[PDB]
Design a protein around this ligand. Sequence first.
Ligand SMILES: CO[C@H]1CC[C@H](n2c([C@@H]3CCCC(=O)N3c3ccc(F)c(F)c3)nc3cc(-c4c(C)noc4C)ccc32)CC1
Length: 112
Amino acid sequence: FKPEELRQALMPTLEALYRQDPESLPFRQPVDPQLLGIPDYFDIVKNPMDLSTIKRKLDTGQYQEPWQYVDDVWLMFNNAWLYNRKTSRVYKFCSKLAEVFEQEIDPVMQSL
Ligand SMILES: CO[C@H]1CC[C@H](n2c([C@@H]3CCCC(=O)N3c3ccc(F)c(F)c3)nc3cc(-c4c(C)noc4C)ccc32)CC1
């Protein structure tokens, strides 16, 4: 896969996530535990991930294969479901994005 081919193919799946508003808002920048006053965040989440990081990796051609992109998107979701309680808005927004991602990534992976 050329990185331009991955970027062209996968960027619309990422755009679909950013289009979810307000559901994407907590995911658009890395969690900042100082600002949010949650010093245990990095005790629980050892490999942080967010949309800005994924976007940067796509933009710069850091993914060799599409599964690596998919793995990072799932890492972001898994981190949020891990840290946050299921009653929280952030966990529910995570679930909403995951549903959108599933629906958009499926045909794309098949094309590829
Ligand atoms: C610049 O705007 C942002 C919106 C999300 C704000 N925020 C908020 C704020 C705190 C105030 C209460 C509140 O409702 N927030 C909030 C704000 C907007 C949302 F869309 C949302 F779901 C939640 N909580 C966040 C939680 C997380 C989070 C993620 C993702 N994974 O683990 C943790 C913890 C990330 C961001 C959170 C921080 C400022």
